[PDB]
Amino acid sequence: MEELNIIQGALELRTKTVEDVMTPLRDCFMITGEAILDFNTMSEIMESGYTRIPVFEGERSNIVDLLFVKDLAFVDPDDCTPLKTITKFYNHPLHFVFNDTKLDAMLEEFKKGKSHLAIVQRVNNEGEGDPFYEVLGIVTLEDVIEEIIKSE
Amino acid sequence: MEELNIIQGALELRTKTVEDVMTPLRDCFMITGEAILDFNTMSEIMESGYTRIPVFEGERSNIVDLLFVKDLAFVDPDDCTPLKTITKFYNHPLHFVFNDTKLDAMLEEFKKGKSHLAIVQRVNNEGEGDPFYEVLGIVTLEDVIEEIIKSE
Ligand SMILES: Nc1ncnc2c1ncn2[C@@H]1O[C@H](COP(=O)(O)OP(=O)(O)OP(=O)(O)O)[C@@H](O)[C@H]1O
Ligand SMILES: Nc1ncnc2c1ncn2[C@@H]1O[C@H](COP(=O)(O)OP(=O)(O)OP(=O)(O)O)[C@@H](O)[C@H]1O
Ligand SMILES: [Mg+2]
Ligand SMILES: [Mg+2]
Secondary structure, three states: OHHHHHHHHHHHOOOOEOOOOOEEHHHOOOEEOOOEEOHHHHHHHHHOOOOEEEEEEOEEEEEEEEEEHHHHOOOOHHHOEEHHHHHHHHOOOOOEEEOOOEHHHHHHHHHHOOOOEEEEEEEOOOOOOOOOEEEEEEEEHHHHHHHHHOOO | OHHHHHHHHHHHOOOOEHHHOOEEHHHOOOEEOOOEEOHHHHHHHHHOOOOEEEEEOOOOOOEEEEEEHHHHOOOOOOOOEEHHHHHHHHOOOOEEEEOOOEHHHHHHHHHOOOOOEEEEEEEEOOOOOOOEEEEEEEEEHHHHHHHHHOOO
16 A cells, blocks of 8 residues: 555654665766856756756865756856856755754755755764764755655 | 654545645646747746646647656757747657546556656536536646645
């Protein structure tokens, strides 16, 4: 039954964390902030199929912004507009989350806000002296939902 | 509690039908097949935030195609390409579903396919002689998901 798998997933929201279902950084379709929204760039982004594209600068672990396909609506390819212009203008808020975060809580924060995408990062206390925040990947509402509705 | 909301939705997956959670035709963002994809049309489609756009011809009930935002990737607004060109090119399959269809069966049909959008239609028996199919609206995976996870 579908109901059994759904209920089981709901139960498992208590146990599992965001790291269990996240899309790790190496599997994330991202883009540099130094990009130029000419026709080719826009077509790449659009055929990627992803609604939300994390924007990094320098290194992929350095997520500095978040691009929506929706933002490309009024963008003319002929103008060759720098992406920095769009990310500065819209300035969609970035949402972060620790790796040990349980799925029920993540579902709660997703529900409560307009947020659908959080950035999974880990507290790197295994120094190398002083610690820092280490971006592991991304987690979306669809991940949680799929963990709910998947068969098992 | 969230677990209980989810379990309850699971319990309601067989009681409720797709008609109960569909987005009715009058609330659907749609587009004519006679449309030309100039800059204004593409910007209007992109601005709407909808990934999948029902393509109607004649009346809005006559859903003949399904447009994907993804299908606008390689389209240049300067060409003023007929939308018919793109719909004929990709030809995304149309999925129809009867209004009395339960949410569990709908969910099962969604999972075992790439399809995420069905057209909710019923059988208008008040003849007027020969019966026919009347398009009521659209239903997506997101709809049944929202049914599952929402509070009650
Ligand atoms: N930029 C990205 N690169 C790689 N994977 C992504 C990206 N954005 C989302 N995903 C992954 O896609 C899966 C489904 O996510 P989601 O459906 O929210 O993305 P989407 O299809 O762009 O959004 P929507 O479902 O609203 O269209 C998730 O597992 C998520 O990790
Ligand atoms: N073309 C459309 N016009 C109006 N409402 C729509 C349309 N497509 C979907 N919806 C509604 O929006 C809600 C969410 O649907 P869904 O999230 O699948 O659309 P989407 O966000 O464009 O797709 P995705 O989430 O995969 O990016 C559903 O309740 C559905 O009924
Ligand atoms: Mg998706
Ligand atoms: Mg959506």
